[PDB]
Design a protein around this ligand. Structure first.
Ligand SMILES: [Ca+2]
Ligand SMILES: [Ca+2]
Ligand SMILES: [Ca+2]
Ligand SMILES: [Ca+2]
Ligand SMILES: [Ca+2]
Lengths: 548, 548, 100, 100, 100, 50, 49
């Protein structure tokens, strides 16, 4: 069955409006995937050790040592917003929907092709491509999620974002266990710290093979493969942001004195002595009821140690932070509430005609005011007693450990039973969409990498690979490296991701932040005279929501 | 029945999504109307003659002479976009709908109040307001459209645009017939032209009375009045604009030479001698097939005389133009394709805290490229024969009538059996919504004032008036002026205007013009520290549409 | 800590973890709030510090009251002024029923 | 309809005992509310800035700057224990109930 | 929540009360750097204003149907049902030192 | 049972500084507190509410 | 997804390492560090912690 197609290209996003303001978004994405023969046919256990870098005192954070199993299989990952929606669709969703529901996912492989390269070793010399009709492409869909979960978006290795531009999958590899020690130090530290990779703990070894745990399918041109329809189990993702802070929760103080003339100088006045006011407070000493002192239900947001690194059996790792805005606009603390920074290129944004190999990037800065501005933090001695005396105040300025560039905010953590928090907002187009939950007894309240964490079950991973096209000479009983015909494959991938949205309703007199084409962004949405493209990142939760 | 309310306030806009991308927009608008006793109780036939102005040679266009019947009735007009939608709703409609259908209209008057002013003529002296419970408000709804149609939007006299700000109706008046002569002249004209108002032609007299042709209703506090539901008969209004011109219709010439390197200098080249090309043309002489010479199906747009005034029995009037863009952006000809200019204030936009009495205004400039740029026009002698010789070219520069500031474009008119044209686009918020068709045997292809022209039938006009609150002294047999108690009324008006929209679909790779809040417009959508408001005009058909 | 005399580790300290057992805020008579609307964040807080009852999926809506504009015979929309209106005030009885 | 009342005053707390030691507390609260005309009829967007206080080094905690929308509406809030129970009821609940 | 600022209805059945003028937070960017009495220079105390992408002007008239009541009229809410966890009226005294 | 959290900690974000909330009860003798440490609430009111 | 190794070992030996083959400031990927352009195994983004 060579002369018949086995599939259809479809990259349309359908918006189906239902009853009561609910829409059913059907994002169709098709892509032509190009796939090469594995450079090797065996699994390799490789160690990566860049001690040359960590050898330099004060370079701990640049540690890359790990051990990974290198498989002869490739992963077809489509878990990233850019694969399903273009700037247009996205603007539609973000400007009018109030919440998003991830419903189901299904993919299929069709119109498979396998060619053989022949070196017409004459003159230049030449190269001749031919069809190997009876050759097969191997396909394995790990439904049971036996294999380790490895999101390609984490390393900008998902399918590309352009319907009219071929793409490729990524060689699949996964972490193996290993013990590693690396002691912190600074430029002036003495002696040689302790930078040792101890190896692997036998009680943590887990060598996985696809061949042994997932049925594999062989497809020839005539064949096709389709996944079933997987249904997610995730909480809805909101498309609105909160702006309220503790300072803006509840009943404002009653102004006894109101401005009588226009002018951004004419303020209103509470009109009551800060120690002669009524209200509630959690400060049993003073009688000062102040906007920064009065009681509030709980606490929106929280403080966590910044540029903290922790260490365990495998080595050091940065301490993650779940947090939004908190601070002026061109007045951040990227570190404090962890604004994510995305590095990618060409195939996932970055102008296409770009040269060199320096990735493009951006630091996403959410609209939700749930972050913190450390410099504003301070601490006072129980006696209160203002103006506070230097001996009774710890400030983001006073040093810690005699260190000049470290202070309590750095060590600080105000997470507790009163912490109100929100989930990570979606990041177009470089963000991951869904993520598999940790199989720990107690799970995390959220994941920092994706807004959708399928709990009870997630779509399995799809592995692809060109099956061994051997030559007439092959001897198992001789390490050699099995000479095999240079074969490559081309197939089309088609996926269908279904969402369920809820149309928003206005509730204020005033208009609202809406995504829109300007005379400034204009050319970020259209190709140029050479056909170069790029996909600029966009914000998602533009639109306020009352928090309390 | 004085202690019971007879109505409900509702100013919500409901968007109900149906099957197949059709939405049903229900715009609810409520308003508190304040109404005063008529200054007179009789109809007056008044003549307006500003000959003092037209006396000055060269001031013909400033002619205001007319005759009108002044009625003791007031008109409650709500026919203007600003009454039904706020910036928010409007942004929603304009950014996502592709077409609009005007479905039905219904209004109602409730919670009527009538008070009596008493001058406590003591010291300052004082004023005392009292309720005249048994007094009546007169209401007349001209269902049959017996009365002359008089759109208040034409003179910025519709109900106000703010739900939380009381409004008032306009004294109703209508044109009476009259013969008037005014001969054109210029500063240097000699003698005294001819500026004569001849009066009225008995065969054109039509004195209308509401009392004689429309049943009138008397409402006391306990009463209420509601219109039925009127259903319109109008063509759908489109919310997209065309950009194609004759120069961009059909198959472009095939470029034999394409640019080989980036750069807005590297052009492509047709590659064929303009007199050696194949194609069709309407120029039987030359063999020049040129982008400006090749044939096109018909003609988008048309040329019409600009700053033309015509005259008939009543006097002079400007010749109307139905036309869009046509020309660069900051490169118009406001006159040529008649861009409308709206003058209004306070109650219908204009910052509320504004002083003085100079109206606010703007000239609406549509996105549809259906206008003309005269300077580009020219005319050639039949022989063609280029480069064209001055003696065979009439240019927008050569004079006409020996006049230096007049040329053929000024006199020009290229309307014909091949003219393709579009209807007037909606103008928020100062634009009129629907308009009653002319009862002429042959009707106009469009109206320049509103996008919706109810043909077979339109909602009738609503007239309101305080009924005569007489005093104990009244003598019919004595002209006097009937002394009557100073009475005024307050009532609530509620209307419901139902539209039917169609959701748009993207069909291009590129994004699209969308309405949106900027750091520049921001404060045009929110009140200030004094509570001042204003409603900035917006465009409607932002979004391209293929014309051919 | 930080060479500061009035600051020490307890001040910076945080021992919250996967083994923390905790209770909710206790009711405070008579000045305490009774119920509170939950934060609409993806991940919510284990408790609210202000009330012992946090209605999650839904809470009673807020009740807003206001005297409607009692205008005088003189009112002109087209003039910022400040709309002179009759001095009016209102008195009404409120009755609520809270079932535990 | 001016000469007819439209409601009843009730500020009784009813304790209804059921089967298996469960009681159903019905707290009734009635109140006469007095309400004045708004000082203004428009919404105002006002900024509050007490820099004069935060200007003084070491006074960070006394920061009050914020922006609020001032509405011509009033809120009728009853969410606070004191509105529903008196010392007596409260003593009853607190001394004998184990959960609410 | 008005309880946050002691602005709920009053606590005495036999004493008239009043509601509170409703107001709500608007978005704004503000910087204030910590300092102590002996800090040098002038820290950084700046109110940058509002971020357009966080603006949300709410109006009651535009989002909630309003009712007009005259003496003859009355208004009643429906019965709202809460969804909250039970609140306990007992306290724990055990500490880690007294477990087991 | 219970946990330790930074006391008289202020954090900052887009809007400005705010005190870090604490969810905690007793812990310590009677006339032997640390009002700050486990955040005992303080209520200010008057006339109409006490 | 581990970084793609442009340079792989060609002979056995626990010394023969593979090499990413791209300048740490010339790589593509995502990061939560809005300042630098350094995408590093200890710097690149991860879902959570
Ligand atoms: Ca930040
Ligand atoms: Ca023009
Ligand atoms: Ca144009
Ligand atoms: Ca903000
Ligand atoms: Ca304590």
């Amino acid at each position: 069955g060579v002369g018949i197609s086995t599939g259809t290209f479809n990259n349309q996003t359908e918006f189906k409006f239902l009853e009561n303001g609910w829409v059913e978004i059907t994002a169709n994405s098709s892509r032509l995937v190009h796939l090469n023969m594995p450079e090797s046919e065996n699994y390799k256990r490789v160690v990566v050790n860049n001690m040359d870098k960590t050898a330099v005192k004060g370079n701990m954070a640049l540690d890359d040592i790990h051990v990974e199993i290198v498989t002869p299989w490739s992963l077809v990952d489509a878990n990233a917003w850019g694969v399903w929606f273009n700037p247009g669709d996205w603007q539609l969703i973000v400007n009018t929907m109030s919440e998003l529901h991830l419903v189901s996912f299904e993919q299929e492989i069709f119109n498979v092709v396998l060619k053989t390269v022949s070196e017409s070793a004459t003159q230049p010399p030449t190269k001749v491509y031919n069809n190997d009709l009876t050759a097969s492409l191997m396909v394995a869909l790990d439904s049971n999620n036996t294999m380790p979960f490895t999101p390609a978006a984490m390393r900008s290795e998902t399918l590309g974002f352009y319907p009219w531009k071929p793409t490729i999958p990524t060689p699949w590899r996964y972490y193996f266990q290993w013990d590693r020690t690396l002691i912190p130090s600074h430029t002036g530290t003495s002696g040689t710290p302790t930078n040792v990779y101890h190896g692997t703990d036998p009680d943590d070894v887990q060598f996985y093979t696809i061949e042994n745990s997932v049925p594999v399918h062989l497809l020839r041109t005539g064949d096709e493969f389709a996944t079933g329809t997987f249904f997610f189990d995730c909480k809805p993702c909101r498309l609105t942001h909160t702006w309220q802070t503790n300072r803006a929760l509840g009943l404002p103080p009653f102004l006894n004195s109101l401005p009588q003339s226009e002018g951004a100088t004419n303020f209103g006045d509470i009109g009551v002595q800060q120690d002669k006011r009524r209200g509630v407070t959690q400060m049993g000493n003073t009688d000062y009821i102040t906007e920064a002192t009065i009681m509030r239900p709980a606490e929106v947001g929280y403080s966590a140690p910044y540029y903290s690194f922790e260490a365990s059996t495998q080595g050091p790792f940065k301490t993650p932070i779940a947090a939004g805005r908190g601070g002026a606009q061109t007045d951040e603390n990227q570190a404090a509430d962890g604004d994510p920074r995305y590095a990618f290129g060409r195939q996932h944004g970055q102008k296409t005609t770009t040269t060199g190999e320096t990735p493009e990037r951006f630091t996403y800065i959410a609209h939700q005011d749930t972050g913190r501005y450390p410099e504003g933090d301070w601490i006072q001695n129980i006696n209160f007693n203002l103006p506070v005396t230097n001996d009774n105040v710890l400030l983001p300025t006073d040093p810690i450990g005699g260190k000049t560039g470290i202070n309590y905010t750095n060590i600080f953590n105000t997470y507790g039973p009163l912490t109100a928090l929100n989930n990570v907002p979606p990041v177009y187009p470089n963000g991951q969409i869904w993520d598999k939950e940790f199989d720990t007894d107690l799970k995390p309240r959220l994941h920092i990498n994706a807004p959708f964490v399928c709990q009870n079950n997630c779509p399995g991973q799809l592995f692809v690979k060109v099956a061994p096209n051997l030559t007439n000479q092959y001897d198992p009983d001789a390490s050699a490296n099995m000479s095999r015909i240079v074969t490559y494959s081309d197939f089309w991938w088609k996926g269908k991701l279904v969402f369920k949205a809820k149309l928003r309703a206005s509730h204020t007199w005033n208009p609202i932040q809406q995504m829109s084409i300007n005379v400034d962004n204009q050319f970020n949405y259209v190709p140029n005279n050479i056909g170069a493209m790029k996909i600029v990142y966009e914000k998602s939760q533009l639109a306020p929501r009352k928090l309390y």
